[PDB]
């Protein structure tokens, strides 16, 4: 069979609805009067009525806005029948990929994280790991996160005693001079931002990490 290629379709479709996707037809038109129809999950199986087809023209249409997070792919099959109901073509697979859109922001597993670190710890010492998640596709830019520290109270002896690992969320000491008798609890605001942490196009969320220095 000469098949039609996969239909890639951005989620949160703008409208107006029902928007057309593709017109299909069987070259048997010229002989006899036909009737088109589509079957499978999306059409005549739950969730029904999302994809519809014109019995006459073969114009396949989508009715509602899609959501990759709910259904990321639809496998449909189109058919062709004559006036007294007989199959005139081998049902064609129509694959519909719901393309991902950056429609939900990062989310830390907790609002406050807690960590510890012994005083006078050599630069390079590991303290704790914050992690966040994103309901977008991890393979798409929409789902790829990057962490950064925004603030650091108090700001002594250095205004950045710590560094966050860009990708992994692991926090490390860069500075020396951790002295409990001077600063007991550093408090960081970490920001996880998506799309490789693109400032303009990236969504963000923040959390807090409280690093107690111990004796």
For residues 120 and 138, which CB has a smaller minimum distance to Ca ion in the complex?
138
77 close to 40: Cβ distance less than 8 angstroms: yes
C-alpha neighbours within 13 Å on the C-beta side of residue 167 = 1
For residues 204 and 202, what is the distance between their CA atoms, to the nearest angstrom?
A: 6
89 lies in the site for a second copy, by CB under 8 A: yes
192 lies in the site for Ca ion, by CB under 5 A: no
Positive or negative, the CA dihedral 185, 189, 192, 196 is negative
For residues 78 and 142, which CB has a smaller minimum distance to Ca ion in the complex?
142
4 lies in the site for a second copy, by CB under 8 A: yes
2 lies in the site for a second copy, by CB under 8 A: yes
- Binding partner selected for residue 136 from Ca ion, a second copy, none, CB under the kind-specific 5 to 8 Å limit: Ca ion
For residues 58 and 202, which CB has a smaller minimum distance to Ca ion in the complex?
202
Exposure string for 41-72, b = 16+ CB within 10 A, e = fewer: bbbeeeeeebbbbeeeebbbbbeeebebeeee
103 marked as binding residue: yes
15 lies in the site for a second copy, by CB under 8 A: no
Q: Please report, in range form, the residues annotated as the binding site for Ca(2+).
A: 11, 67, 69, 100-104, 134, 136, 142, 194
């Amino acid at each position: 069979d000469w098949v039609i290629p996969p239909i890639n379709l951005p989620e949160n479709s703008r409208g107006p609805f029902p928007q057309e996707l593709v017109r299909i037809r069987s070259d048997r038109d010229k002989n006899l009067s036909l009737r088109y129809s589509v079957t499978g999950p999306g059409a005549d199986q739950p969730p029904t009525g999302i994809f519809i087809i014109n019995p006459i023209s073969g114009q396949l249409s989508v009715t509602k806005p899609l959501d990759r997070e709910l259904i990321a792919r639809f496998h449909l099959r189109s058919h062709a029948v004559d006036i007294n109901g007989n199959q005139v073509e081998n049902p064609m697979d129509i694959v519909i990929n719901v393309i991902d859109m950056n429609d939900n922001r990062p989310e830390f597993l907790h609002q406050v994280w807690n960590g510890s670190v012994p005083e006078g710890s050599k630069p390079g010492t590991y303290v704790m790991t914050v992690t966040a998640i994103d309901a977008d596709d991890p393979n798409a830019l929409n789902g790829m996160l990057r962490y950064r520290i925004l603030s650091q109270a108090p700001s002594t002896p250095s205004p950045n005693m710590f560094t966050i690992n860009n990708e992994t969320g692991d926090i490390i000491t860069v500075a020396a001079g951790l002295d409990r008798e001077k600063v007991q609890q550093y408090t960081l605001i970490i920001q996880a931002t998506d799309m490789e942490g693109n400032p303009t196009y990236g969504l963000s969320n923040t959390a807090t990490a409280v690093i107690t220095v111990t004796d």
